[PDB]
RNA sequence: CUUGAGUCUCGUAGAGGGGGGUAGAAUUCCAGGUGUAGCGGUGAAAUGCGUAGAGAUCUGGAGGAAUACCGGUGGCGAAGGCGGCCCCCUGGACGAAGACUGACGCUCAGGUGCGAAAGCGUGGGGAGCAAACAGGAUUAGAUACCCUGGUAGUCCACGCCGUAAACGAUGUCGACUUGGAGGUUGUGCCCUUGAGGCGUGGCUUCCGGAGCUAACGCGUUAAGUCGACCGCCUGGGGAGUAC
């Protein structure tokens, strides 16, 4: 429908919970016949500045071709979920399946 | 008729833009201005200093032929950029010749490293090379008789920015500038750079593969303020300069000359 | 303009470096600019005026240069 | 002497942090298109990318802040 | 704007050839649909003045088209206005 | 008083008056001095010399703490900026870092109106 | 009938508009730590804040407003105007080829809408700034300029107001007439042999030719050469006032 690109940052103490969260997110996307073109756990990462007093955080990239309702839902979930510190759902023109420059 | 049209495409065919075709005949000499005519719209105001060879006196009388250069047209009145750069292409060709047989042989004599590689001079010109290139091993030409005769065996060349370090003695043995701007960095790496334009606060020596250096007015000499850089150095000349400072961000490498 | 004195570096040199850094930043200039409120109009005017001046310097002066002074 | 014209990139990436880092100051500020010689079209894109990065704490807003 | 598929559909219905697209009637239909779409938007966003300008322009264009149709060929116009449900 | 080897010098350099404050690395102020305090008033205290002497005074004040290493944080625009740090150096601390810490907003609050003189 | 006008296809750049989120810097205040006599301010002072612990400095919190750098005689918009980042809804512009419609056009008195800032109404909000006001200076006086404070207001919602040097002091639309140097945004070809080479469109900054102009100047974005429609002027004041 519309090709979004999502990057969310999880609190580093909840790093072991991340995979489950990712799975959940994927599931929702799948539900509305939404494809998920790339998905990249960047892992624990040093922040350029300390958001909410903490210096590292766990970054997950995820590209999705989904309807906007589901995106909205995801956003809502993120906002209420306290594990995820920041998110940045961000539209894109194409599917962009090729890997990110920091993974490579 | 189409005589002229054909003559035009003929004359297009029998010239090119760079200093390649040795065509300008020296048709008046006067100190301090040479002048040619390479089939261009006007005659060059040549310096005398693009034409004296290795000890200071002139070499070419009337009728003699050197190509100059091009791709710059009309600053008001006149035609060229200097033929001496011409010469650089010839030097490049000889350096390239190495590749064929994996060994360019001339003479290289390198006494010392301004910036970590002995300086080698070929014919009139002198070039700077990275520190390893001067010696094959750890021999070091400091114990060799000063300004000794070998050749140059090439150690390293930078391929974009022109720095070539060559192999003295041991005959038997045989986007782009700004990401990795850490090569000439570390505090004081001396460089050989041609100055371009002196902006009454500066001199703008800039050679190392698409960068910009200043050497502004404060150093330049050992007088501060009364100096006026046009009096004190040159126009278009390869000099002693080193970095003293790099900002890889606001591309201002601030070189010096008082060293 | 965060700076650290290198091992066996002179004080004066360090100071100079710091100064240079500051200059690069344009921190002082920025401060000066934000001392008082500039009306948008005024800001616009300065920018355009400055531009005009620059243009004048570049072209008219170049034209003058073509002709010799003596 | 623009990099992005030569590379021929379709869009500048905020994730490509290293690349961004060449166009950002020691103090964190985005470097002018006069200095870098970046093309105007690309410059804006680059700026946007940088901004995005800053939001994601990939690049810093400034040197001092902590 | 109007989605491509929707536009195509509109063209097919009103246009005689279906490749035609520029038929007056077809154009009118296209305009009308757009107007309808924008009504919803403008109910929500009453202060979106700039956008509303475009809508107004579109409406004007439609009116003009209708007028043109009327002088040329009355029956067709009548048919069109029955189809779309344009009071005039 | 507990002696401390390393600390910070905060140099608040205004247009009218320089204030030097030596503190520990954590934030807790040890001593301070000012150009206004050093026996300079009006025209005099808005000068580099004044700033320097303030700095000197400050240094003198934190003698008992036994401070060898010192990082400098320079704030605001003023004469007392280079001079002050020089003075500090003279007074004989190993100057470790020289930081600028001027508060630059990213366009935030409206400044006061421009003076008509 | 297809050259004007419009529709469709694919892209393009954009501070165009409306709505909802969020980020970081800085100011202010609150609470607490450290610390000690000044701070602040000016031409110079004083009012003012300070030993009831200010200023400085560090930690934590609150809240509002605006968005450094990018940033540009850059961009978009009918004008007014529009500037962090993200999403949702949404208007226009331009190019590339085709395909279609077939004069459907231009202008517009009345009419209708949009229309900076200030201002008004009701309800919120209120950090900073600041008409009014107060004090301190300056001064012959100082109902000002400068300083210290400071309330409407600025901010948001929904209404009204309908004006500005609302300016390019230049109505809109179309056609035609020598050039140069740029900027920006497409696009065709070319060995992109490289940041290039040769074109071709849109918008745009400066200089200047003919011509025009009282001169200043304008000059393919005309103030030139013409056509279509509208608006407006008829000495200065009285007056854009009175009724």
From TrEMBL, chain A:
GO MF term set: small ribosomal subunit rRNA binding; structural constituent of ribosome
Record has RNA-binding as a keyword: yes
Modified residues (N6-acetyllysine): 93
Sorted UniProt keywords: Acetylation, Ribonucleoprotein, Ribosomal protein, RNA-binding, rRNA-binding
Superkingdom of the organism of origin: Bacteria
GO biological process: translation
Keyword Cell division: no
GO cellular component, one term: cytosolic small ribosomal subunit
Function: Binds together with bS18 to 16S ribosomal RNA.
Family of this protein: Belongs to the bacterial ribosomal protein bS6 family.
Protein name: Small ribosomal subunit protein bS6
Gene: rpsF
Part of the whole protein covered: 1 to 104 of 133
């Amino acid at each position: 429908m519309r090709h979004y690109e999502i990057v969310f940052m999880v609190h580093p103490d909840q790093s072991e919970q991340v995979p489950g969260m990712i799975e959940r997110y994927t599931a929702a996307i799948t539900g509305a016949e939404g494809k998920i073109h790339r998905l990249e756990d960047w892992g624990r990462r040093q922040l350029a500045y300390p958001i909410n007093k903490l210096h590292k955080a766990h970054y997950v990239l995820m590209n999705v071709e989904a309807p906007q309702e589901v995106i909205d839902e995801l956003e809502t979930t993120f906002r209420f979920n306290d594990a995820v510190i920041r998110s940045m759902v961000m539209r894109t023109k194409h599917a962009v399946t090729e890997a990110s420059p920091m993974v490579k | 008729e189409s005589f002229a049209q054909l003559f035009e495409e003929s004359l297009k065919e029998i010239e090119t833009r760079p200093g390649s075709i040795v065509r300008g005949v020296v048709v008046a000499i006067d100190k301090d201005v040479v002048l040619v005519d390479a089939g261009l719209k006007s005659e060059s105001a040549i310096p005398a200093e693009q034409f004296k060879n290795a000890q200071g006196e002139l070499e070419i009388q009337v009728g003699d032929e050197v190509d100059v250069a091009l791709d710059a047209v009309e600053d008001g009145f006149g035609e060229t950029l200097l033929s001496r750069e011409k010469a650089k292409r010839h030097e490049a060709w000889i350096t390239l010749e190495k590749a064929y047989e994996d060994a360019e042989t001339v003479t290289g004599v390198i006494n010392g490293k301004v910036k970590g590689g002995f300086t080698v001079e070929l014919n009139g010109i002198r070039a700077f090379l990275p520190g390893s290139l001067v010696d094959v091993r750890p021999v070091r030409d400091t114990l060799h008789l000063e300004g000794k005769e070998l050749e140059f065996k090439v150690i390293k060349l930078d391929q974009k920015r022109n720095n070539v370090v060559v192999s003295r003695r041991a005959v038997i043995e045989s986007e782009d500038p700004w990401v990795a701007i850490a090569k000439r960095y570390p505090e004081g790496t001396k460089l050989t750079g041609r100055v371009t334009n002196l902006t009454d606060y500066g001199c703008f020596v800039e050679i190392e593969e698409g960068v910009e250096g200043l050497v502004h007015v404060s150093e330049m000499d050992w007088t501060n303020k009364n100096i006026h850089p046009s009096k004190v150095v040159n126009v278009g000349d390869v000099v002693e300069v080193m970095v003293l400072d790099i900002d890889e961000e606001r591309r201002r490498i601030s070189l010096g000359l008082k060293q | 303009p965060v700076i650290k004195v290198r091992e066996n570096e002179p004080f004066d040199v360090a100071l100079r470096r710091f100064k240079r850094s500051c200059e690069k930043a344009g921190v002082l200039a920025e401060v000066r600019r934000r001392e008082f409120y500039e009306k948008p109009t005024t800001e616009r005017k300065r920018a355009k005026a400055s531009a005009v001046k620059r243009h004048a310097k570049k072209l008219a002066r170049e034209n003058a240069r073509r002709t010799r002074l003596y | 002497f623009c990099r992005f014209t030569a590379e021929g990139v379709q869009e500048i990436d905020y994730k490509d942090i290293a690349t961004l880092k060449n166009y950002i100051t020691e103090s964190g500020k985005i470097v002018p298109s006069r200095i870098t010689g970046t093309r105007a079209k690309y410059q804006r894109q680059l700026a946007r990318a940088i901004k995005r990065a800053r939001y994601l704490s990939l690049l810093p807003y400034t040197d001092r802040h902590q | 704007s109007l989605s491509t598929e929707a536009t195509a559909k509109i063209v097919s219905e009103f246009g005689r050839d279906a490749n035609d697209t520029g038929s007056t009637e077809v154009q009118v239909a296209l305009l009308t649909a757009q107007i309808n779409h924008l009504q919803g938007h403008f109910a929500e966003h009453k202060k979106d003045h700039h956008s509303r300008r475009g809508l107004l322009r579109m409406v004007s264009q439609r009116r003009k088209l209708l007028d043109y149709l009327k002088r040329k060929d009355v029956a067709r116009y009548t048919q069109l206005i029955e189809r779309l449900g344009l009071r005039r | 008083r507990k002696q401390v080897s390393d600390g910070v010098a905060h140099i608040h350099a205004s247009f009218n008056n320089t204030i030097v404050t030596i503190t520990d690395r954590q934030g807790n102020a040890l001593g301070w001095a000012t150009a206004g305090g050093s026996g300079f008033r009006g025209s005099r205290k808005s000068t580099p010399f004044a700033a320097q002497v303030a700095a000197e005074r400050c240094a003198d004040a934190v003698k008992e703490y036994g401070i060898k290493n010192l990082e400098v944080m320079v704030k605001g625009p003023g004469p007392g900026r280079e001079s002050t740090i020089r003075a500090l150096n003279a007074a004989g601390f190993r100057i470790t870092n020289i930081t600028d810490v001027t508060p630059i907003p990213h366009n935030g609050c409206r400044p006061p109106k421009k003076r008509r003189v």
